[PDB]
Every structure is written in C-alpha cells, then in structure tokens.
Amino acid sequence: WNPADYGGIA
C-alpha cells in the first residue's frame, strides 16, 4: 500500500 498507487487502494 504505497501513496502514489492510490485509486482503488486508499
């Protein structure tokens, strides 16, 4: 869970 990846994962 990394900040730049966020969209579905939050």
Tab-separated table of N, CA and C in Angstrom:
chain	number	residue	atom	x	y	z
A	1	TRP	N	0.872	-1.194	0.000
A	1	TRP	CA	0.000	0.000	0.000
A	1	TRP	C	0.912	1.249	0.000
A	2	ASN	N	1.160	1.787	-1.204
A	2	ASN	CA	2.091	2.929	-1.386
A	2	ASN	C	1.294	4.200	-1.811
A	3	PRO	N	1.515	5.412	-1.237
A	3	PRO	CA	0.771	6.642	-1.618
A	3	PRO	C	0.578	6.993	-3.114
A	4	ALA	N	1.611	6.798	-3.942
A	4	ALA	CA	1.492	7.052	-5.405
A	4	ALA	C	0.532	6.095	-6.169
A	5	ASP	N	0.400	4.849	-5.701
A	5	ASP	CA	-0.544	3.862	-6.295
A	5	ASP	C	-2.061	4.159	-6.083
A	6	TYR	N	-2.415	5.041	-5.140
A	6	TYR	CA	-3.807	5.126	-4.638
A	6	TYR	C	-4.879	5.542	-5.681
A	7	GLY	N	-5.967	4.766	-5.660
A	7	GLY	CA	-7.138	4.985	-6.529
A	7	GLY	C	-8.245	4.050	-6.011
A	8	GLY	N	-8.115	2.753	-6.325
A	8	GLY	CA	-8.920	1.711	-5.646
A	8	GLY	C	-8.426	1.443	-4.207
A	9	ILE	N	-7.127	1.143	-4.076
A	9	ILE	CA	-6.453	1.075	-2.749
A	9	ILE	C	-6.366	2.523	-2.191
A	10	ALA	N	-6.812	2.719	-0.944
A	10	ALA	CA	-6.808	4.062	-0.335
A	10	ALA	C	-6.500	3.909	1.157
